[PDB]
mmCIF file of C-alpha atoms and ligand atoms in Angstrom:
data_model
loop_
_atom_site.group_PDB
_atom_site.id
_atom_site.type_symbol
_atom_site.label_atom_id
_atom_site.label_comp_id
_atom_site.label_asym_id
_atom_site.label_seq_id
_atom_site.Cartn_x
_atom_site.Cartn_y
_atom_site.Cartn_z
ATOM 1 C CA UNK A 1 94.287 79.907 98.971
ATOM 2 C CA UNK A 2 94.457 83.200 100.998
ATOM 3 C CA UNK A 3 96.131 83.364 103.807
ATOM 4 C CA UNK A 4 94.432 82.933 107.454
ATOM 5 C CA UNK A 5 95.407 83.909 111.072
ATOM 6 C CA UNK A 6 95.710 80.725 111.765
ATOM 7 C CA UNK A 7 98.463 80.707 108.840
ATOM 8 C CA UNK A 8 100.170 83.868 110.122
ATOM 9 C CA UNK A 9 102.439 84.318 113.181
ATOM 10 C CA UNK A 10 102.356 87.448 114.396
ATOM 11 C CA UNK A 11 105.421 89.093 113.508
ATOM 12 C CA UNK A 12 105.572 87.080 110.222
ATOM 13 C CA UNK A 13 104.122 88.654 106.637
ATOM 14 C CA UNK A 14 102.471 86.717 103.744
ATOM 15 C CA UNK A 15 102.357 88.278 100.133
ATOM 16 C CA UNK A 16 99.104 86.806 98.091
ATOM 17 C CA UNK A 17 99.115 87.544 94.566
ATOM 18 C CA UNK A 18 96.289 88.827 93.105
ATOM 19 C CA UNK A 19 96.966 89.321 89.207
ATOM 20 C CA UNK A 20 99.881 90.080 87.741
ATOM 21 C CA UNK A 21 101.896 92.826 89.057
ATOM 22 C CA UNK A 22 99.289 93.048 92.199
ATOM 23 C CA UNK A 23 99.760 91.323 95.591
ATOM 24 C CA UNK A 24 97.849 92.299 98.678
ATOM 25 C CA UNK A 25 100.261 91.667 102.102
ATOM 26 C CA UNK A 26 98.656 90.331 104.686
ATOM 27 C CA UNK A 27 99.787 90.772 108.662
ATOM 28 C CA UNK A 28 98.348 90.108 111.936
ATOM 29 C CA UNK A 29 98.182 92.111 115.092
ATOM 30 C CA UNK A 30 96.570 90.858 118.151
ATOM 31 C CA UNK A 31 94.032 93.892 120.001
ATOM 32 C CA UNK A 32 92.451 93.149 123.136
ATOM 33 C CA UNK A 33 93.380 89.331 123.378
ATOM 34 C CA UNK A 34 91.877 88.502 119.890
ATOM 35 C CA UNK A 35 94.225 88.215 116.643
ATOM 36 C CA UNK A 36 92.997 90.471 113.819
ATOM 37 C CA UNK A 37 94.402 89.745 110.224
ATOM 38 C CA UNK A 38 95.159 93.171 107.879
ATOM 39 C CA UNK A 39 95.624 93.816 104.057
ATOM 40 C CA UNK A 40 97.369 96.266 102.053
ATOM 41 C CA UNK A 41 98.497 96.693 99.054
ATOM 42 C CA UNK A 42 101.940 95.981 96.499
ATOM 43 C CA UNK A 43 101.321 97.375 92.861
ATOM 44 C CA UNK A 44 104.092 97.243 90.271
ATOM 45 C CA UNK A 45 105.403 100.058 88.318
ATOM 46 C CA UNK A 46 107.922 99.920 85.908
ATOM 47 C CA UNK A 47 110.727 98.403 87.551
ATOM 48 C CA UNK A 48 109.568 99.742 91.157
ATOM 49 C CA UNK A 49 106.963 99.023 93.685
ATOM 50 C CA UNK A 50 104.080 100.871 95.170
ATOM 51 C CA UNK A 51 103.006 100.255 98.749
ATOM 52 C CA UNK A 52 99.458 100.988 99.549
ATOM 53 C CA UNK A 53 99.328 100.961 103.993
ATOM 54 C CA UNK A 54 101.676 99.490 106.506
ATOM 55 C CA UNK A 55 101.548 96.108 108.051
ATOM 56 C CA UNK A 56 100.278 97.466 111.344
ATOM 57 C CA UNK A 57 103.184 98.428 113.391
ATOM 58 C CA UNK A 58 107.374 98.614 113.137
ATOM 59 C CA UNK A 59 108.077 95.254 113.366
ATOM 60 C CA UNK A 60 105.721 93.728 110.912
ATOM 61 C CA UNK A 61 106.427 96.798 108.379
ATOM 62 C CA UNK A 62 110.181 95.613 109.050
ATOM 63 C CA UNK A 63 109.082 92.053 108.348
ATOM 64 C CA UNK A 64 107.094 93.156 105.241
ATOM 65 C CA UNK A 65 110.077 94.956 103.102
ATOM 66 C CA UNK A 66 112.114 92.289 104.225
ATOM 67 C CA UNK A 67 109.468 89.812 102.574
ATOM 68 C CA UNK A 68 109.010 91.719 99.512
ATOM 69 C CA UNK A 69 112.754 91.809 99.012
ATOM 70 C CA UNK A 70 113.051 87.920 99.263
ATOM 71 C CA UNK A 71 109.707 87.329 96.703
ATOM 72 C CA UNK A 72 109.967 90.052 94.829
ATOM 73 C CA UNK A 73 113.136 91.853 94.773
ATOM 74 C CA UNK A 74 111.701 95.290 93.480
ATOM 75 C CA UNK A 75 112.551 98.492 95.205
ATOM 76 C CA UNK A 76 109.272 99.972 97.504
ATOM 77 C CA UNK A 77 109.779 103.414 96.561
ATOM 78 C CA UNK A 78 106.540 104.653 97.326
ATOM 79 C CA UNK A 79 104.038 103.853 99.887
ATOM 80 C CA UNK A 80 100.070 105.730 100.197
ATOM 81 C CA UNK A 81 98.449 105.264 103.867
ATOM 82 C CA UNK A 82 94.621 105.038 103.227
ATOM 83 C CA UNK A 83 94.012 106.614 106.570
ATOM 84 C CA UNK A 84 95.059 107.861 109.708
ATOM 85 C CA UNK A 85 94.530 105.104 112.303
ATOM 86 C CA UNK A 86 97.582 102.683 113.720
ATOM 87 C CA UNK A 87 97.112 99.547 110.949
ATOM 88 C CA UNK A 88 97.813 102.196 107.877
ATOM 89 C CA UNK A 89 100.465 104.548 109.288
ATOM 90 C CA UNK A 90 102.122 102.497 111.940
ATOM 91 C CA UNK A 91 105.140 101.741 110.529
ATOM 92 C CA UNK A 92 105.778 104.710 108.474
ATOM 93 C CA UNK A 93 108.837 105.277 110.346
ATOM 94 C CA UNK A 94 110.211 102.218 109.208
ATOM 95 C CA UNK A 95 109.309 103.033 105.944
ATOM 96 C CA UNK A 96 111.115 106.379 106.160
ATOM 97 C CA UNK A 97 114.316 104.913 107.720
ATOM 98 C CA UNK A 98 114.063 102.643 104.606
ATOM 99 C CA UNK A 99 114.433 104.836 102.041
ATOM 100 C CA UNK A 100 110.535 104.645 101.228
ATOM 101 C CA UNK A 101 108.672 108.124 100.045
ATOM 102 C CA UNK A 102 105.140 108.151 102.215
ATOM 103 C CA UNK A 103 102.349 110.104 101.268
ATOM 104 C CA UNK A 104 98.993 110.477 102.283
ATOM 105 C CA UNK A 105 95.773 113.178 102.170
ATOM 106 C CA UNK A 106 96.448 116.134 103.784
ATOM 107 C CA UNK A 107 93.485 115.318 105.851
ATOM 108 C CA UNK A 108 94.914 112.021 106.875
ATOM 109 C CA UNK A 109 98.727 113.768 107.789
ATOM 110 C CA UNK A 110 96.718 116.229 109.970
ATOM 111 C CA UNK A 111 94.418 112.963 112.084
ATOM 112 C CA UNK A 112 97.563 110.852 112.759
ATOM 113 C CA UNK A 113 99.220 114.687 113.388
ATOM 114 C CA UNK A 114 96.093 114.483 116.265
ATOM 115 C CA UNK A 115 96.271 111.238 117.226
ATOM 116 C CA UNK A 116 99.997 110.912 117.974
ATOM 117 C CA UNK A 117 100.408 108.456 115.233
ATOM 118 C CA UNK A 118 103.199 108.534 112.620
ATOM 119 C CA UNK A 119 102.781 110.903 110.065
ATOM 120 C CA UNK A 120 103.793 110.573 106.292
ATOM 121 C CA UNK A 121 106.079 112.949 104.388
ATOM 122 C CA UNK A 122 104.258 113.392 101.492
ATOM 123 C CA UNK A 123 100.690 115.371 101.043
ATOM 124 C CA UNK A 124 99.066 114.014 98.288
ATOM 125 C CA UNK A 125 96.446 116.955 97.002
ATOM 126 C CA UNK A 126 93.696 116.571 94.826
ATOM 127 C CA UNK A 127 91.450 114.268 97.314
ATOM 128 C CA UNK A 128 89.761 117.050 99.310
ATOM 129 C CA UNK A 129 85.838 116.378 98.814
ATOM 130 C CA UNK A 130 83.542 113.447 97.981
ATOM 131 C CA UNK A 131 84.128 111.442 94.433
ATOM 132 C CA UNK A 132 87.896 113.327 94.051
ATOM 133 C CA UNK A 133 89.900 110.720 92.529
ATOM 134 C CA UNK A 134 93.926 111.117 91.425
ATOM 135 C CA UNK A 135 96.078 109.100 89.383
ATOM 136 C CA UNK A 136 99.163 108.239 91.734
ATOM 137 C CA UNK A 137 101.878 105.853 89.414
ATOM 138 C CA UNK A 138 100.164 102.761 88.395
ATOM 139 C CA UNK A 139 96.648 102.986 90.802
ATOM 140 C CA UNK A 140 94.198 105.592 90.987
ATOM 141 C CA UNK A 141 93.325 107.086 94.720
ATOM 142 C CA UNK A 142 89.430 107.755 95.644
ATOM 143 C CA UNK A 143 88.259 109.950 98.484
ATOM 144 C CA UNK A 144 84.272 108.297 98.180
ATOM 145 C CA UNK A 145 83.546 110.451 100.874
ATOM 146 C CA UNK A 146 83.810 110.064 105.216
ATOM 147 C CA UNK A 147 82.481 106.482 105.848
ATOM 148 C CA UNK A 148 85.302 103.798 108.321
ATOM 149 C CA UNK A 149 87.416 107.127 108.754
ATOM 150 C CA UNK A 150 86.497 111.119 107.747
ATOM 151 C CA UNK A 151 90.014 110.799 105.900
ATOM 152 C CA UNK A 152 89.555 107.022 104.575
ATOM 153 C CA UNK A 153 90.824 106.673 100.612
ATOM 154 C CA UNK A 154 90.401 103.303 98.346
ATOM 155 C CA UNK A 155 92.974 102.275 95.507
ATOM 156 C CA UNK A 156 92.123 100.919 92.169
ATOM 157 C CA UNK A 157 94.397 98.986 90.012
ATOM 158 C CA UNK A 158 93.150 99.423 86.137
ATOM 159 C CA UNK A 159 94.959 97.116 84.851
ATOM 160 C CA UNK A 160 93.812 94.454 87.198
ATOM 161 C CA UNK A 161 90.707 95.532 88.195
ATOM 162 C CA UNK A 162 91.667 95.377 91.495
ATOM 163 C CA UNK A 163 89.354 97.431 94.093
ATOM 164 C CA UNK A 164 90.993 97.958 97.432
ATOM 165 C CA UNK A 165 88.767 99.236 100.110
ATOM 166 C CA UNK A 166 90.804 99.852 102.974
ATOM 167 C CA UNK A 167 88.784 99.703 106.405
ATOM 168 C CA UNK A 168 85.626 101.196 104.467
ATOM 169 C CA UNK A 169 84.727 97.915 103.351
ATOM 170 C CA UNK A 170 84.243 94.981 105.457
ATOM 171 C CA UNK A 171 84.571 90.930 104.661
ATOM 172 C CA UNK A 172 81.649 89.081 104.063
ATOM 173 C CA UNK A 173 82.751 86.709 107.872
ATOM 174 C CA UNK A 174 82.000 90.309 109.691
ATOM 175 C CA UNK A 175 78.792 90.698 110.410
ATOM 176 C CA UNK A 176 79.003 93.596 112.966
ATOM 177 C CA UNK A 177 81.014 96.804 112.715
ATOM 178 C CA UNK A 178 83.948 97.262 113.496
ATOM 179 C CA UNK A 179 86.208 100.107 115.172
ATOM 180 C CA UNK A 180 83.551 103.261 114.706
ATOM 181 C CA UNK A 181 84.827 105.227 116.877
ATOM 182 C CA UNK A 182 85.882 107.380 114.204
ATOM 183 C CA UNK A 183 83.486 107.076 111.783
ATOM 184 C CA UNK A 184 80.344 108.865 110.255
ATOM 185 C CA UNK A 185 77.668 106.254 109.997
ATOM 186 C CA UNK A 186 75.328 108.349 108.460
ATOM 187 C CA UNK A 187 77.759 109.286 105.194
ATOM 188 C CA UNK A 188 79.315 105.485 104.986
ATOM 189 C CA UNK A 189 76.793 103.593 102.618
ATOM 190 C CA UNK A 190 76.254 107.465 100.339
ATOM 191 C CA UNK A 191 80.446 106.741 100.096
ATOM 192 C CA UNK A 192 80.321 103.095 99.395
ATOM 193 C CA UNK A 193 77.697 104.021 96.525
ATOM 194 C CA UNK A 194 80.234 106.185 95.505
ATOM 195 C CA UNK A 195 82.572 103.235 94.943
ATOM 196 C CA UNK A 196 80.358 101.591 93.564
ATOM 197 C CA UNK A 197 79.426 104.023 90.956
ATOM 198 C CA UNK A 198 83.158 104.944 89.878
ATOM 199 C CA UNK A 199 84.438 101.137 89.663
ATOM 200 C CA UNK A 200 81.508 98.943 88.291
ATOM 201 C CA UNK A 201 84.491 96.683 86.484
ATOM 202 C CA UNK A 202 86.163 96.158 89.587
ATOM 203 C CA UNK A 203 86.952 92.095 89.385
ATOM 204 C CA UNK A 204 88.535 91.789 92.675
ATOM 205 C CA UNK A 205 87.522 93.302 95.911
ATOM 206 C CA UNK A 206 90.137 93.692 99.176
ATOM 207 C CA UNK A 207 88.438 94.481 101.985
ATOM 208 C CA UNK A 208 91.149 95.996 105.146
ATOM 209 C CA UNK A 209 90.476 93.121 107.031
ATOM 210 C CA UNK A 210 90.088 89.481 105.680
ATOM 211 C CA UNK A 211 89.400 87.309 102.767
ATOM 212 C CA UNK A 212 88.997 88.847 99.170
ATOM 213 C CA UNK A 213 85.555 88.895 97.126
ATOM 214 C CA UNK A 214 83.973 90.921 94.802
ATOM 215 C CA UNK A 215 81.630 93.860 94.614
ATOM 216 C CA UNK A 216 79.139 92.014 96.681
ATOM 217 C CA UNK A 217 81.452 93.383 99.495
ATOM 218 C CA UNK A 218 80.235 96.737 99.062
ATOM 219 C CA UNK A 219 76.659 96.047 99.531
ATOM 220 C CA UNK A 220 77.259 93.871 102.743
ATOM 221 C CA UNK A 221 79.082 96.677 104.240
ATOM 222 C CA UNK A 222 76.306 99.280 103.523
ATOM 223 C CA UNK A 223 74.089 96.231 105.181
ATOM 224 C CA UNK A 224 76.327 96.091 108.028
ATOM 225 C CA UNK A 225 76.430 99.901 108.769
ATOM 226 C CA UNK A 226 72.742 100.597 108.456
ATOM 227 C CA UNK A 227 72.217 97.866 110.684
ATOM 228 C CA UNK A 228 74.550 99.343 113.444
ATOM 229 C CA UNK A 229 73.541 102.651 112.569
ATOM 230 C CA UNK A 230 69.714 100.793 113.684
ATOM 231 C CA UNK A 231 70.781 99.460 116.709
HETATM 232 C C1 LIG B 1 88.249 95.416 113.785
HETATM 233 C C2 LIG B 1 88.876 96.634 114.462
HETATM 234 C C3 LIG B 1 89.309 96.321 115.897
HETATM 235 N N1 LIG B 1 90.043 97.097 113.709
HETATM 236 C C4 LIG B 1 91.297 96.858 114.058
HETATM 237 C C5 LIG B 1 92.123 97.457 113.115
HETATM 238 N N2 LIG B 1 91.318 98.022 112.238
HETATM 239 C C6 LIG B 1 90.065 97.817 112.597
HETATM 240 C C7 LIG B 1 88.892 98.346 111.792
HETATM 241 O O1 LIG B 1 87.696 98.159 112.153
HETATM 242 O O2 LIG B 1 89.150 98.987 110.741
HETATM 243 ZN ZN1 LIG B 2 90.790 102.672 110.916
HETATM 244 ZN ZN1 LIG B 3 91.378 99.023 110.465
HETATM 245 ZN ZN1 LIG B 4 76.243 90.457 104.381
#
């Protein structure tokens, strides 16, 4: 079964695979006295691996390639951060000092560039307006449009079917939004629906935070949003 906080030492990293060649890693990180769980992404390629965000923070993206070295034994050679906020580039310097390549949107480099964060090497063009989408090794990148983040990006596996939505699409347990500070509330659900129209297949859906489902995830995030956007 997937993983838990409860499960999950902060500090610690669990690998959950998805289908074959596809895990999602799952972290926690503790923010304002409450313990938040966070997924990203490991996709096989060849005889290499492709790492889709951080594990929030140095220590747990130390404690993540050291994971992925014991299970796997693969080299991360690449790694994508979906957008510019502290749970997808906070670690990237760990990544660097590994040996990892990290890339992200231009847009997203120039946020965390902003925000103080750490900033990837890479700039990964093609992504610039609404329904862009790039091949990028074995996934293909989205830019659906500003919806969590201005910058946020979603990664499909095609031969898996697996959706990843990054912190544009929420788990069916949250039923209130999330951090919005960021976000544009009035583009998010015209994004998701542009999700939703380029990967109607999907067969797995990982939302950033919390327990996998399928498409129905899209639609209860568009609920959740309209309903804040409401308030
Ligand atoms: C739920 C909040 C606090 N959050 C923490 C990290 N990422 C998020 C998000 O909403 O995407
Ligand atoms: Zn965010
Ligand atoms: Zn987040
Ligand atoms: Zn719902």
């Amino acid at each position: 079964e997937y993983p838990t906080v409860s499960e999950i030492p902060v500090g610690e990293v669990r690998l959950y695979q998805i289908a074959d060649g596809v895990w999602s890693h799952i972290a926690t990180q503790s923010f304002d006295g409450a313990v938040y769980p966070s997924n990203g992404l490991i996709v096989r390629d060849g005889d290499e691996l492709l790492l889709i965000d951080t594990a929030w923070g140095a220590k747990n993206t130390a404690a993540l390639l050291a994971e992925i070295e014991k299970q796997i034994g693969l080299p991360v050679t690449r790694a994508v951060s979906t957008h510019f906020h502290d749970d997808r580039v906070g670690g990237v310097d760990v990544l660097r000092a590994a040996g990892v390549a990290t890339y992200a949107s231009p847009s997203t480099r120039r946020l965390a560039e902003v925000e103080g964060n750490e900033i990837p090497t890479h700039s990964l063009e093609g992504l610039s307006s609404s329904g862009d989408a790039v091949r990028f090794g074995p996934v293909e990148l989205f830019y659906p449009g500003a919806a969590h983040s201005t910058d946020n990006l979603v990664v499909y596996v095609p031969s898996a079917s697996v959706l990843y939505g990054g912190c544009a699409i929420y788990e069916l347990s949250r039923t209130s939004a999330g951090n919005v500070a960021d976000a544009d509330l009035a583009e998010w659900p015209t994004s998701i629906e542009r999700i939703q129209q380029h990967y109607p297949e999907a067969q797995f859906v990982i939302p950033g935070h919390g327990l996998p489902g399928g498409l129905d995830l899209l639609k209860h995030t568009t609920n959740v949003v309209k309903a804040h956007t409401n308030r």
